[PDB]
Amino acid sequence: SNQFLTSDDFQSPSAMPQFDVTPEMKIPGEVHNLMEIAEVDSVVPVNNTKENINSMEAYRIPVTGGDQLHTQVFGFQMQPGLNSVFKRTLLGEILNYYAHWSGSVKLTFVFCGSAMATGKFLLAYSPPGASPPQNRKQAMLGTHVIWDVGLQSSCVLCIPWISQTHYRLVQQDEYTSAGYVTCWYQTGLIVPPGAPPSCTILCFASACNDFSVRNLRDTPFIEQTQLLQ
Amino acid sequence: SNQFLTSDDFQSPSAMPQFDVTPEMKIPGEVHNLMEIAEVDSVVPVNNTKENINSMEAYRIPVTGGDQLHTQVFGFQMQPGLNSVFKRTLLGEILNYYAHWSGSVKLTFVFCGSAMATGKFLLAYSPPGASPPQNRKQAMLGTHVIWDVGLQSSCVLCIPWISQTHYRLVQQDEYTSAGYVTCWYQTGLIVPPGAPPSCTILCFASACNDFSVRNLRDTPFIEQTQLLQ
Amino acid sequence: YHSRTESSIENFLCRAACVYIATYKSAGGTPTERYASWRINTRQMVQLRRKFELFTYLRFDMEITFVITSTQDPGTQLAQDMPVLTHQIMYIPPGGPVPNSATDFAWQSSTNPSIFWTEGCAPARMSVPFISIGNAYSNFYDGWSHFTQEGVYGFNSLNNMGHIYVRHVNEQSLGVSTSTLRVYFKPKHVRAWVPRPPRLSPYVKSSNVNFKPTAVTTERKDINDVGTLRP
Amino acid sequence: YHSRTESSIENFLCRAACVYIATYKSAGGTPTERYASWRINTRQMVQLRRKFELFTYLRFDMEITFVITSTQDPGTQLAQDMPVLTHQIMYIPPGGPVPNSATDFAWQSSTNPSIFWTEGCAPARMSVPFISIGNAYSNFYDGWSHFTQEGVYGFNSLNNMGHIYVRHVNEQSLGVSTSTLRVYFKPKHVRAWVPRPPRLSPYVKSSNVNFKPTAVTTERKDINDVGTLRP
Amino acid sequence: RVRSITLGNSTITTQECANVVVGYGVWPSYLQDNEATAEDQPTQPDVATCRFYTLDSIQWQKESDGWWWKFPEALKNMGLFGQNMEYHYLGRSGYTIHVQCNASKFHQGCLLVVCVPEAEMGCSDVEREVVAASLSSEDTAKSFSRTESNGQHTVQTVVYNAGMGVGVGNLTIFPHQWINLRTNNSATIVMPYINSVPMDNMFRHYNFTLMIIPFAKLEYTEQASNYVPITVTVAPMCAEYNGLRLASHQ
């Protein structure tokens, strides 16, 4: 009509015709899709416990050494964008720019201990309509891998995409409809005389190749509204 | 739209259709580009020292004869359009009509002495990020030609185009980012009995074939604003 | 290797320029401010005069555009609802009937091309071809108008482009409406010959080349005086 | 298998956004509120600043749209019937004459492209190409403006897009008409390089990257604290 | 498997066979014809500037937070490459930063070695600006801090915001490598020349910043040497200039 849709692509007359643009040169690192920024790993703040968030201690998962053998290392609700563990990483900063999302999440746990240390962890994953495991025996009968840190230093754990519908809303909280990734002590942490007994795990989350987003909007993080000065 | 851009080419209905225009005849001297006016040499006012500008003495570079052998003949900052030496010549009157410029400058120094006179001058050029030479020994180690006026009467000195970016702003003054062209006595000026001891040099500046301008605007020289009468 | 299309003669001499701003009323009084008038000459505006006087002989069509904005005059007897203002812009071809005042038969002459324009839409535009007995216009004329070296030194030459006259068509009795005309002249298909040097001295009047003796450039301290030496 | 066209760089950085709302009157007083002015920078609006600061180097054309709605001011001496309001929007190209106030020659400068728009129809639109000596704009500049590490830490860079100045063309004597401009800026043909992390700390000013130390994420009860466990 | 690298007739570095990171996917190269705007020829000093400039070693202690060097100021005094930064006007160079540590098998820790293009940094005081003396030293590192810096013209050197106001775990977006002392020992990143102009003056502009941040802190028992030396070695690649003149300054 004779209206102005703000979401309407139209050519306009150039204000400065007869002007030659500077010839574009080859700059390395061209981006064509926002999903290429989400498919890189970013360090996941798993230890966000209100006295670590203002330090580097909210990136290090503590694995103490001694006699536990039945307790938990960590655990979180597997939903990027709304969970505090994931909403500030590169994947969960791009998901907050969109209202729908669909795809897999790839986790990677790196054991940052000494080469003389040896142990075993049970990395369990629970499905979306399922309760978090409460002990190591319940987590064993679910979906688990055994990460023997004497043999491998990283444990890549890819998480499947299970939903009734095609996409999934980012800003909503369907409790008990996302999945949990917990980790349990299996053996402990065995060190020789001279090695430090306690250690550190780091987690890295990214997207996969089947990832997609839809329905762009404004990020919840920026609250400022008035112009700067 | 239904607007009026002043910089918009559109055909209009002819006020006088049915009128036959006078057939154009061959007039010699057709101009197709403004750069053809800039590629002619114009006499450069090098001696503009506040008591020569209202005379012809602001075109003649004095070369006195006697015992100097270590002093300077002249020297200027090599930037056409903003320097007072160059902003009123044909090249620097066209450059003031534009905001960007790019290309080489060709200088020519003609020794207007008698045929019995003999001497040598050192014509040094300094690069844009470089200090003006202070004596003849500093100018020798830079970029110089030796102009022996007994052999040649003119010394053509073309100046290279060095910049970080593609074009260059005309009305701005980047100090120590333009280059200096100085001239030093090498031998003196040797004359037989009967020849005049003092002489005269004239300078001629133009553009080259790689010259270009951009972003037309109004000349800084014309200050009158109200219409004539 | 760059491009030289920015400094062609078409791209240097074809920009629209406001060359004339006048005002004209719509009610009585003296019979002079009821219309506007502009003899088409490229000498009253110094900025465009200097660009045209880089050449001796020029040849171009004209592309004139009129920006007419009106207003309501203050005082008593105001119009309240007034219909719409229609304006007549008449181009008197060189040697054509010229209006002494408003409501003159010259306005209704068929010979003088005219535009009737209603306010509220796109501005009025007209194009005039190269109108000369000669084969070009001349910015300079080293000569005289009559035969035996008598007359004015280059003013009655065949460089006449005509006049432009603008008035209100309405018959408005109550209230006065003051309109302001802006003329945006532009040459098209310019062909220029014999390049001349750019002028140094400032202009004094738009009928001459008269001047006062000015310096060739701006002064400096010494002959060997480069400037500042920041480092 | 889904489609990834929703998160391309063109579909993520090309949405129109209101970046500047100003107002400008039409009668005298102080010579400041009679016109509007906006230096084109993508740093005053935080929402668009964060999207542009996911990249180091950008290259785009501009697509600016102006939504001008006027009103009649209260008080005595009202215009009753007022013809129509025409507005001039001038784009001063970088390094171009900039108006000190209204009715300044800068407005009538041929160099600064302008739009004359009459109220009651579709809004005014203009497109500006990539105007830089460099080969891209830079959202960040780890460096200085002058030579010897002196100057402001990245503010006089060649990232200048120009200004936009808007005024009333009318000469309105009786009555004041207050117009409000809305600028809907939009980039076209965006090409972006060197992806950067999204910002955590809030902004303080649109000339810096200054910040206050903020937490990396939001707190939780324990390391093994999944939330709610509805069942 | 212990292959030696000789670059120029001065330098020898010994290194095993490990993984490299090549830029944003491009190798450094020389400028072609349809890429420059300058009015002259580059005259690259290939015969003298391509060698290894091994900087001084830093001590990774238990309580250290991180270090950064700004480039190309990090080679301002390093030999002939520092002379070319003096006696020229424009410059263009890629680099091959090689970072390696000497730890035992009884040490533990993890480093993140980032190359951040255009790492513009904010000040420790808002409504104020940094000085050039607080951005970088000429050859020594600048330390991040655990707590909040509070100076007037300094840099906000808190470690989890990386001096740029971002999350420190998201610096993995730029070219990076992880030195995990359990398995990895060394890290080598090949940075190209990234700018918006083909050549810039390498006194005012900082092309990139090399940050080395420990994410898992260093632990050791009481027998052990209570530090791990981190040795950085920078080798310029395809360096070419323009604008021969005197040195300023000096």
CSV table of N, CA and C in Angstrom, one decimal, chain B residues 103-104 125 127-131 159-168 174 176-177, chain E residues 36-41 88-90 197-201 204 242-246 248:
chain,number,residue,atom,x,y,z
B,103,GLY,N,47.7,10.8,-6.8
B,103,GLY,CA,48.6,10.8,-8.0
B,103,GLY,C,49.9,11.4,-7.7
B,104,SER,N,50.7,11.5,-8.8
B,104,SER,CA,52.0,12.1,-8.7
B,104,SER,C,52.0,13.6,-9.1
B,125,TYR,N,64.9,15.2,-2.4
B,125,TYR,CA,63.5,14.9,-2.1
B,125,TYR,C,63.5,14.1,-0.8
B,127,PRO,N,61.1,11.7,1.9
B,127,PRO,CA,59.9,11.0,1.9
B,127,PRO,C,58.9,11.6,2.9
B,128,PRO,N,57.6,11.1,2.9
B,128,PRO,CA,56.6,11.7,3.8
B,128,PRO,C,56.9,11.6,5.3
B,129,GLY,N,57.2,10.5,5.8
B,129,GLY,CA,57.6,10.5,7.2
B,129,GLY,C,59.1,10.7,7.4
B,130,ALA,N,59.6,11.9,7.1
B,130,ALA,CA,61.0,12.2,7.2
B,130,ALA,C,61.3,13.7,7.4
B,131,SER,N,62.4,14.0,8.1
B,131,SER,CA,62.6,15.5,8.4
B,131,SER,C,63.3,16.2,7.2
B,159,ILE,N,57.6,13.2,-8.6
B,159,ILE,CA,57.5,12.9,-7.1
B,159,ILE,C,56.6,11.7,-7.0
B,160,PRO,N,56.9,10.7,-6.2
B,160,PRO,CA,56.1,9.5,-6.1
B,160,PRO,C,54.9,9.7,-5.2
B,161,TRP,N,53.9,8.8,-5.4
B,161,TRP,CA,52.7,8.8,-4.6
B,161,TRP,C,52.8,7.8,-3.5
B,162,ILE,N,53.0,8.2,-2.2
B,162,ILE,CA,53.1,7.4,-1.1
B,162,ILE,C,52.1,7.7,-0.1
B,163,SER,N,51.2,6.8,0.3
B,163,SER,CA,50.2,7.0,1.3
B,163,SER,C,49.7,5.6,1.8
B,164,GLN,N,49.2,5.6,3.0
B,164,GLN,CA,48.7,4.4,3.5
B,164,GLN,C,47.4,4.0,2.9
B,165,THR,N,46.5,5.0,2.6
B,165,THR,CA,45.2,4.7,2.0
B,165,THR,C,45.2,5.1,0.6
B,166,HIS,N,44.0,4.9,0.0
B,166,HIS,CA,43.8,5.0,-1.5
B,166,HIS,C,43.9,6.4,-2.0
B,167,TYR,N,43.0,7.3,-1.5
B,167,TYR,CA,43.0,8.7,-1.8
B,167,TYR,C,43.6,9.5,-0.6
B,168,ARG,N,43.5,10.8,-0.7
B,168,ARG,CA,44.1,11.6,0.4
B,168,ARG,C,43.3,12.9,0.4
B,174,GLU,N,48.2,17.1,7.5
B,174,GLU,CA,49.0,16.2,8.2
B,174,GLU,C,50.4,16.7,8.1
B,176,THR,N,54.4,16.7,8.6
B,176,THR,CA,55.4,15.6,8.5
B,176,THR,C,54.8,14.3,7.9
B,177,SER,N,53.9,14.5,6.9
B,177,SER,CA,53.3,13.3,6.2
B,177,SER,C,53.1,13.7,4.7
E,36,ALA,N,46.6,-3.3,-2.5
E,36,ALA,CA,47.2,-2.1,-1.9
E,36,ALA,C,46.7,-0.8,-2.5
E,37,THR,N,47.0,0.3,-1.7
E,37,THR,CA,46.6,1.6,-2.1
E,37,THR,C,47.8,2.6,-2.2
E,38,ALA,N,48.9,2.2,-1.6
E,38,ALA,CA,50.1,3.0,-1.6
E,38,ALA,C,50.7,3.2,-3.0
E,39,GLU,N,51.5,4.3,-3.2
E,39,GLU,CA,52.0,4.7,-4.5
E,39,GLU,C,53.4,4.2,-4.8
E,40,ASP,N,53.8,3.1,-4.1
E,40,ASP,CA,55.2,2.6,-4.3
E,40,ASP,C,55.2,1.1,-4.1
E,41,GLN,N,56.4,0.5,-4.1
E,41,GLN,CA,56.7,-0.9,-4.0
E,41,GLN,C,57.1,-1.3,-2.6
E,88,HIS,N,60.8,3.3,9.0
E,88,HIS,CA,59.8,3.1,8.0
E,88,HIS,C,58.5,3.8,8.5
E,89,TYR,N,57.5,3.8,7.6
E,89,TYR,CA,56.2,4.5,7.9
E,89,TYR,C,55.1,3.5,8.0
E,90,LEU,N,55.0,2.6,7.1
E,90,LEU,CA,53.9,1.6,7.1
E,90,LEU,C,54.6,0.2,7.3
E,197,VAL,N,42.9,-1.8,6.7
E,197,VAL,CA,43.7,-1.2,5.7
E,197,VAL,C,44.8,-2.2,5.3
E,198,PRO,N,45.4,-2.1,4.1
E,198,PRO,CA,46.4,-3.0,3.8
E,198,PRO,C,47.7,-2.8,4.5
E,199,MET,N,48.0,-1.6,5.0
E,199,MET,CA,49.3,-1.4,5.8
E,199,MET,C,49.0,-0.3,6.8
E,200,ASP,N,49.5,-0.4,8.0
E,200,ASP,CA,49.3,0.5,9.0
E,200,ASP,C,50.6,0.9,9.6
E,201,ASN,N,50.6,2.0,10.3
E,201,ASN,CA,51.8,2.5,11.0
E,201,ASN,C,51.9,1.7,12.4
E,204,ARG,N,51.4,3.4,16.6
E,204,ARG,CA,50.1,3.7,17.2
E,204,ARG,C,49.2,2.6,17.3
E,242,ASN,N,57.0,0.3,3.8
E,242,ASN,CA,57.0,1.4,2.9
E,242,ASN,C,57.3,2.6,3.6
E,243,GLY,N,57.9,3.6,2.9
E,243,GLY,CA,58.1,4.9,3.5
E,243,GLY,C,59.5,5.0,4.2
E,244,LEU,N,60.6,4.8,3.5
E,244,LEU,CA,61.9,4.9,4.1
E,244,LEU,C,62.2,6.4,4.5
E,245,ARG,N,62.6,6.5,5.8
E,245,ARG,CA,62.9,7.9,6.3
E,245,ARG,C,63.8,7.6,7.6
E,246,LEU,N,63.9,8.7,8.4
E,246,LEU,CA,64.7,8.6,9.6
E,246,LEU,C,63.8,8.0,10.7
E,248,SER,N,61.9,8.0,14.3
E,248,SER,CA,61.2,9.0,15.1
E,248,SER,C,60.3,8.3,16.0
